[PDB]
Amino acid sequence: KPSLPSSEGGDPALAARLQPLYSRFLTDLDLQPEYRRHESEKLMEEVLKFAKSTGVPHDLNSHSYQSLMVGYTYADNCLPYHDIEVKVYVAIYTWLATICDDAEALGIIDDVQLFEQRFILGEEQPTVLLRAFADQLKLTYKLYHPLVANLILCSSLNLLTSTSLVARKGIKEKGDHPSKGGNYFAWYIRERDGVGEAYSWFTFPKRQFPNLDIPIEAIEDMTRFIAYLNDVLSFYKESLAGETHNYINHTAAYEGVDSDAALHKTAQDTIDCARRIESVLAGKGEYEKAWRLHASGYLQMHVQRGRYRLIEVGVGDAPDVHEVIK
């Protein structure tokens, strides 16, 4: 199982190997315009109030608070001009979902695996975390068109399932012993664990973005952009924690190349997705502009937040005093 999150130590040799790729990737993504923030202090007030309402602990310097700061920053950087109820919704979703994402390290896979059957039977979840996530999934329907909320929910449920699959020894065995012809397995797991489809659709809540038809052709590329950008830049922190049965390493295994080759390919794949999204969204009004600010903000979130430890690689920013893991 992976180690728990930490702010201590690191891997200087891996950081030296990754810094050149990471610095070139940040430039070559060429995400414009510059990221924006809006009503940042009002957002923090409203996020902390909602967080209190869930009952889920988020003490300063905890893993939970680290994840709350990821969710705050996701909304602040990626959805700056969105309705504040939507920004809080995404911040809180991202807090809870990133804790679930760490379920193997936290020892909560058993209840994560049982979440979906309890959810569709109306059985209350066993923990404060999972009751808050279930309530957050139901809240999606207040803010997103029902078809879009439907897709957000199936993507969110697939997170829990794929996180549980990678916790299985027989699934970790695939990376060590890849089957000939099995190359699609890397994206099979990554499409489901990465929640790229949910995060793509979060850009387009129904009141401000009432026409789901306008950006839909781009969703797949937005999903892959989101998943692949994180696969490149979270490789460092995943290596530190031993959570290395990931898309990069699975890709390297099926393609018979090393992690560095899969990182370079995945970096180029991210750029190719970003350029296709900008072609599809050319002349699509507020949809085009909202996506552009989401992509630019999403790169900066990784630069900024302690979850990704990028200050250690020389491309990120030092953590805030309360976000450092104690």
Q: Does 98 participate in binding ligand BTM (rule CB under 6 A)? A: yes
| Shortest Å distance, C-beta 319 to a copy of itself | 35
| Helix residue ranges per DSSP H, the chain | 12-28, 40-54, 63-78, 84-101, 103-106, 109-121, 128-143, 146-166, 169-176, 185-193, 196-202, 219-233, 235-241, 247-255, 259-280, 285-304
Is 101 a known ligand-binding residue? yes
Contact 102, 5 (CB under 8 A): yes
| Shortest Å distance, C-beta 113 to a copy of itself | 6
One DSSP character per residue, 91-144 reads: HHHHHHHHHHHTHHHHT-HHHHHHHHHHHHHTPPPSSHHHHHHHHHHHHHHHHS
**x-marked contacts with ligand BTM along 110-149 as a string, rule CB under 6 A:** ----------------------------------------
Apex 195 CA angle, 193 and 198, nearest 5? 160
**x-marked contacts with ligand BTM along 197-236 as a string, rule CB under 6 A:** --x--------------------------xx--x------
| Shortest Å distance, C-beta 250 to Mg ion | 13
Among 54, 66, 94, 259, binds ligand BTM (CB under 6 A): 94
| Shortest Å distance, C-beta 301 to ligand BTM | 7
What is the C-alpha separation between 69 and 147, in angstroms, rounded?
Answer: 29
| Shortest Å distance, C-beta 18 to ligand BTM | 17
Among 17, 37, 131, 168, binds a copy of itself (CB under 8 A): 168
Among 1, 36, 52, 138, binds a copy of itself (CB under 8 A): 138
Tokens of 243: 């959570």
Apex 229 CA angle, 316 and 188, nearest 5? 140
Burial 60-98 (b: 16+ CB within 10 A, else e): eebbbbbbbbbbbbbbbbbbbebebebbbbbbbbbbbbb
In eight-state DSSP terms, residue 7 is S
Among 105, 151, 226, 313, binds a copy of itself (CB under 8 A): 151
- Which among 16-24, 28-36, 52-60, 187-195 is the span making contact with a copy of itself, rule CB under 8 A? 187-195
Burial environment of residue 267 by CB neighbours within 10 A (0 to 12, 13 to 18, 19 or more): buried
Q: Does 32 participate in binding a copy of itself (rule CB under 8 A)? A: no
The length of the chain is 326
Q: Does 188 participate in binding a copy of itself (rule CB under 8 A)? A: yes
Is 230 a known ligand-binding residue? yes
Residue with tokens 């899969």: 262
Is 41 a known ligand-binding residue? no
Binding site for Mg(2+), residues?
101, 230, 234, 238
Interface contacts to ligand BTM, rule CB under 6 A: 94, 97-98, 101, 159, 194-195, 199, 226-227, 230
Interface contacts to a copy of itself, rule CB under 8 A: 113-114, 116-117, 119-122, 137-138, 141, 146-147, 149-151, 153-154, 157-158, 160-161, 164-165, 168, 170-171, 173-174, 178-182, 184-185, 187-188, 192, 211-214, 216-221, 224, 275-280, 282
